[PDB]
Amino acid sequence: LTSTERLIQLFNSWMLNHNKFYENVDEKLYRFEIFKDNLNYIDETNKKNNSYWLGLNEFADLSNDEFNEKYVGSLIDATIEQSYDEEFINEDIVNLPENVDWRKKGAVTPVRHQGSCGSCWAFSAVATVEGINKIRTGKLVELSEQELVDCERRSHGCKGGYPPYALEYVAKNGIHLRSKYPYKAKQGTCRAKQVGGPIVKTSGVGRVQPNNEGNLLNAIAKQPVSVVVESKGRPFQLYKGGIFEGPCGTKVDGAVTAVGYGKSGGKGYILIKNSWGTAWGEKGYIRIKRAPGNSPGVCGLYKSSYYPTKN
Template identity: 55%
Template sequence: MALSSCSRLLFVASFMLFSFFVVTSSDPAHDFSIVGYSPDDLTCINKLINLFESWIDKHGKKYKGLEEKLRRFQIFKDNLKHIDERNKVISNYWLGLNEFADMTHDEFKKTYLGLKTDQLPKRNQSPEEFKYRDFENLPNSVDWRKKGAVTRVKNQGSCGSCWAFSTVAAVEGINQIVTGNLTELSEQELIDCDTAYNNGCNGGLMDYAFAYIASNGLHKEEDYPYLMEEGTCEQNRDESESVTISGYHDVPANDEESLLKALANQPLSVGIEASGRDFQFYSGGVFDGHCGTELDHGVAAVGYGSSKGLNYIIVKNSWGPKWGEKGYIRMKRNTGKPAGMCGVNKMPSFPTKTN
């Protein structure tokens, strides 16, 4: 009996390196929703291996040996199944293969989150003290990227320093709004030097980091570059110029209208719960998936708008430009829940700066 082209390729491959990949014959056929691949491609074992190899090349992955590569392939296959199954049932956003596709969800959470809310500072809950309380004529949409107040998407890598990236994004924004200069600032300085309450790669909070910058200023990124690990504090590095802020304000918690008022005036630091599996593979659209409100990730809100009847907040992440919509996620607003999507309304804050 003649073999199909897929079977012939698999037969030949059995004598080669990839014969060691374990894929059970009891796996059901899946209509995988991966751009550029047909259902037949992704039910053929050899094609799955080819997809894995092309993904490895695209993302420059390196593994210590065959055993590790086999383990990562199995994780990759399981993640591929999750992406396919979710894309069949969700409609307003979609998932895709990204550089995290060889990580288990537990590995991902341990590596890329880092907001610590167990020792929250006392927050300003008084509406009377909220700086933008009386702001009127809220625009229909705001995008601080288009206004020149947002720097490139950065990548925290394998350091739980999201809190520093969230802080810096908000400070870069207000600095540009006040001075007209868009200047990349140093997350590494916060990781190394802001240690009274924050814990470097083991997490922290944006309000504490704002307080540090108000007291000490913050160096430029080029003068104090990111290491993806904790280093030695060099607060006076090269005596180079620092950017300063006057202080910070908290937006009243669980109040989306107040969040939008503040966001219409400047980028904000916000906390979200990003531990859901769909977050790992978010690729585009308005995210309205399942998530709670236990904040575990610091990000920056840089605008809001509407698309096809869905209102959203534009969020800048720190997982690099290959994640999501070139490093951003649009998160649904007007959910009817005070805490908002994934708790985005729970803990917004922003730096202040005078001329």
């Protein structure tokens, strides 16, 4: 029962350590109650003895339903796909690298925060291209996701999107500088035209053979791939570190960027850069378990991957 002062004192640090203010006293009271509940889920679950751990991250504050409301940032879907530029000339056989990490080769930008906007699709693409660019130009630069939300009207801004559409958009129109067309957390009129600075260009997009690990790994190996996953899970909400191995279903709702893969003695994984800031997961990133060869992947990870192709 002393525990109570302990908890209060504790909720308190978590608060300023994540720059959290509440206007009225009762909200804090409410928040505190949520927090407490979350914490319990976090213990019952860490005691489970799995390969990762949950924690008091950026979202400890919120309830699960509340979390999906403002941050899941959905995907939309098309059928009998447009049969893309270069159908990934099908891979499989391993005995290719052991560990890849496109951050070592200065090909990944700092991590970002998508706010209360369902723009993960835009963010995902921007990343994969920022990468394929440095792999060619030997120069890494900060591109604007904002353009994609405002132009590229096939996908619906904050209401969700489709990454391939975002990609085909570059092949056809290039893309501007983040510094020039900043991100604003809501869709505006496509100002692509009245904004200066160089524009990165590309030629096409490539679709990788789904539901197979080999195909993906080899793809990742050449450059960073945009891929999908089911992020609505409660575990996922409160992830802190490790090799996440569920629980999570295959009903995908978000776009992320796989920037590597590796193995930590026994367990193999794919390394992803997410759009939730640095206070979530491992400094913005998450490492997900690898399902071997044939399946949709853990949390439907293998389900849908694409990459820009540059001249």
